[PDB]
């Protein structure tokens, strides 16, 4: 595949070339630097379980095919979030009201709904069939009728390195996913929009924060703090095998 | 590097050439006199953990590179505090009000804020890239476009010794850091300014002290006394391996 790296390197980010930037840390055995965006992040070992790739079973190098399937899933989920962020910023910040009420103001019912759903699913099923059918011969799955989709050959055309685009794409998509999670959770606690929250925070950043919106802003903090205290205990327990 | 010493010596200060000036004290194994400002101060052994230097991994002398990275961090943090102390004394003691309200009286909002932030970050990212890129070939990181930055060669031009400037710089920076911590905590308990506290203490030094400002002056003393009683018990426990 061309979705895998060519140099097997770890980039030096905020603290080190690994999350958890202390000296008592050994990266997980199945993460060795072969895929873009590697940092050894796996507190719950979901890379050795959690999925079944569409490959012939009992073929050697099957445990690696599962990480490639999960990477395909990660890229696919990020490529939609990067489009959704642009599509919500270019609408909510141009003329329109809350972005979470636009679909409910189309008045789609009866026959048009049915024909739209059926046609969209026909197209997506035809594309998905080809994706599944591509992954199985070559360990890669391009979305638009081709296994690789490089209409303009730019996968190695960046003047700062060979495998630079591959590392940039998996990181922009990774940032956009939790960007959109932020939009979805912000719209439910504050009631305002994205820009209307940034400006409120920049105006006076000591009452226009999360801790001043009532019970929801406390419930989210509680959930976040409880989930963040479990994946660190899990990592500490993992380091003792 | 030229940030390390040439003579491997310990200077004799307030009590001895070590903190904890008693006879039952052996310096930590990783602190041996090779860096400026050495005193064997390490109750919590943060010099063998806590960080990952940007060097090629598995290269010999990796445990020493981490102390050099932490020394780089110490010098970097001190060089900003020494500028901030001068910048707050030359403003608060010249004409202006509380120094912790100046940024809030610039009225920076909208486009100017965004362009200023983006430009500053562009410049700092360009400089930081060069710093990270310098540390990795030579174990040193100068901030201003050069690995060493000696426009006027004065690193060995002091008429009291060879490595005198190196020991003076790490100590002035070390004093300025807790100087500024004092300014920040003083402004929150007293409400006055820096000079307005020194003059109040010199006027009548038995009611213009920390113990007479209410509950905050007691909370700070309590926190200080609780943190000071933990790093001595830790040192005593360390001395018994
Ligand atoms: C409350 C829980 C919690 C906390 C406190 C942290 C804290 C941290 N995480 Mg995170 N993390 C958490 C939950 C949490 N994590 C969860 C739930 C997940 C699952 C998704 C992760 C997954 C995760 C990963 C995968 C990584 C981290 C990393 C980090 C570090 C960088 C954070 C960062 O970029 O800040 C944002 C900060 C900035 C963009 C710049 C900071 C500058 C600000 C604006 C002010 C100046 C800086 C500051 C003053 C300097 C120190 C001063 C201070 C000591 C007084 C940091 C120690 C990274 C790390 O440690 O890499 C080595 C990392 O790779 N975390
Ligand atoms: C759905 C998106 C998705 C998927 C499929 C993956 C998949 C992968 N990531 Mg992860 N990752 C993602 C999003 C995703 N990532 C995001 C958004 C971040 C930013 C925090 C990261 C950051 C990250 C790092 C730093 C690293 C990986 C790595 C990996 C690989 C490790 C194996 C693994 O855990 O796979 C299984 C993963 C799943 C099956 C997804 C499980 C989703 C859970 C169950 C839902 C949790 C939802 C909850 C609301 C989260 C709240 C977070 C918020 C509070 C902060 C794998 C290819 C490692 C690697 O080597 O990559 C090449 C690696 O070093 N990822
Ligand atoms: C917090 C939000 C969130 C999170 C955490 C995820 C996480 C995930 N999505 Mg995504 N997704 C989201 C929002 C989110 N999604 C939204 C808003 C949309 C709208 C378009 C989608 C639509 C979507 C689709 C259509 C699909 C995913 C899939 C996935 C999974 C892909 C990883 C993989 O291949 O492992 C595969 C892991 C398994 C097969 C283990 C199954 C265990 C179950 C599912 C536990 C739950 C991953 C768990 C893919 C998937 O396979 O989901 C299961 C998938 O088909 N997502
Ligand atoms: C997947 C994300 C997503 C989703 C679900 C929607 C959904 C919607 N958008 Mg769209 N939109 C998106 C992304 C998205 N948008 C993007 C990326 C942009 C920036 C160009 C916009 C800009 C935009 C505007 C300006 C408006 C909408 C509006 C709408 C609504 C009516 C449909 C319409 O007029 O579309 C029009 C959308 C477009 C002309 C751009 C579509 C871009 C597609 C989805 C990106 C993917 C293209 C694909 C990969 C190309 C394949 C090429 C290959 C075969 C070679 C609808 C709820 C209208 C609205 O808000 O009504 C109230 C409206 O005025 N959108
Ligand atoms: C993706 C990045 C992102 C950004 C830039 C912001 C920005 C903001 N959020 Mg947060 N937010 C995010 C994700 C993000 N959010 C996520 C993932 C969640 C779900 C847990 C929320 C849920 C949330 C709520 C419920 C509220 C905010 C609010 C705010 C504002 C005040 C800060 C605060 O209270 O943070 C709180 C942050 C958290 C609870 C969790 C940390 C969020 C991520 C993981 C930190 C990422 C750090 C990273 C270095 C930032 C990059 C910035 C980017 C420009 C490069 C501010 C505009 C408040 C607001 O609107 O005030 C007006 C508010 O009420 N956010
Ligand atoms: C409440 C807790 C506490 C106390 C009582 C002390 C006490 C001491 N520390 Mg400190 N220390 C503490 C917490 C504390 N430390 C903490 C939290 C840290 C972490 C940052 C350290 C880290 C630390 C280090 C790294 C070092 C010390 C050192 C010292 C000694 C010198 C202090 C000094 O310069 O005073 C200031 C005094 C003067 C500048 C001059 C004194 C003159 C005054 C004005 C009056 C006259 C002197 C006096 C009357 C003479 C004795 C008389 C008396 C017996 C009646 C002293 C025994 C040093 C040491 O022992 O070196 C051998 C040393 O190197 N400490
Ligand atoms: C951020 C600044 C900073 C940093 C990075 C370092 C780094 C270092 N110092 Mg330390 N040092 C500092 C400030 C700093 N120092 C200050 C301000 C003082 C004066 C009290 C000293 C005094 C001192 C001595 C006397 C010695 C060192 C030495 C060392 C080395 C020991 C290894 C170590 O612990 O590193 C790791 C350190 C860190 C990761 C910083 C941790 C910061 C903690 C977690 C925060 C505590 C904040 C809290 C509010 C403090 C309140 C104090 C107040 C109540 C008095 C290392 C290079 C030894 C050496 O050989 O130097 C060459 C040595 O002998 N330092
Ligand atoms: C009490 C105040 C205080 C203290 C104790 C520290 C302490 C520290 N600062 Mg500094 N800093 C301060 C105020 C303070 N800062 C202020 C006011 C500013 C404004 C400019 C900054 C901005 C600043 C930046 C931008 C950075 C630091 C960094 C650091 C760390 C450098 C040591 C190192 O390289 O180890 C490295 C140690 C680790 C990677 C271990 C991570 C463990 C986490 C961070 C525990 C917390 C050190 C812990 C640097 C750093 O790396 O921070 C983590 C860093 O990038 N500081
Ligand atoms: C890092 C510390 C720091 C910070 C954050 C600030 C911040 C500020 N200062 Mg400045 N200031 C500083 C240090 C600092 N100062 C120093 C060191 C001095 C002594 C010369 C002053 C003296 C000073 C005065 C007299 C005034 C301010 C004022 C201000 C405010 C408006 C900006 C301005 O007019 O700057 C003007 C600042 C300068 C002309 C001096 C800047 C010195 C820089 C920061 C030192 C570093 C230089 C750099 C290393 C050189 C690189 C060379 C290399 C390429 C070869 C602003 C909040 C104004 C104010 O209070 O308005 C209400 C104001 O009147 N400052
Ligand atoms: C927890 C854990 C354990 C470890 O072992 C490893 C690990 C990495 C798994 C780790 C963490 C995993 C994490 C944090 C994963 C997070 C995944 C996340 C947050 C994924 C988010 C995906 C979001 C997506 C697709 C969003 C799609 C949004 C769309 C929106 C569509 C819109 C709608 C509805 C109408 C609007 O008018 C217009 C528009 C906004 C476009 C649709 O266009």
Residue numbers in the entry:
A (entry chain B), B (entry chain A): 51 to 291
What does the study report here?
Since only far-red light is available at a deep layer of the colony, P. crispa has evolved a molecular system for photosystem II (PSII) excitation using far-red light with uphill energy transfer. Here, we purified a light-harvesting chlorophyll (Chl)-binding protein complex from P. crispa (Pc-frLHC) that excites PSII with far-red light and revealed its ring-shaped structure with undecameric 11-fold symmetry at 3.13 Å resolution. The primary structure suggests that Pc-frLHC evolved from LHCI rather than LHCII. The circular arrangement of the Pc-frLHC subunits is unique among eukaryote LHCs and forms unprecedented Chl pentamers at every subunit‒subunit interface near the excitation energy exit sites.
Pc-frLHC is an undecamer with 11-fold symmetry. Pc-frLHC is the first example of a ring-shaped eukaryotic LHC. On the other hand, subunit‒subunit interactions in Pc-frLHC are strengthened by the long N-terminal regions of the subunit. The long N-terminal region of every Pc-frLHC subunit interacts with the N-terminal regions of both sides of the subunits in the ring-shaped structure. We found 11 Chls and two carotenoids in the subunit of Pc-frLHC. We, therefore, modeled the 11 Chls as Chl a. The vio and loro in the all-trans configuration were assigned in the L1- and L2-binding sites of Pc-frLHC, respectively. Chl708 and 603 are located side by side, and Chl609 makes stacking (π‒π) interactions with Chl708 and 603; Chl603, 609, and 708 form a unique trimeric structure. Instead, Pc-frLHC has His171, and this His residue coordinates directly the Mg2+ of Chl708. Moreover, the ring-shaped arrangement of 11 subunits in Pc-frLHC enables Chl708 to interact with the Chl613’-614’ dimer in the adjacent subunit, forming a Chl pentamer that may contribute to further red shift absorption.
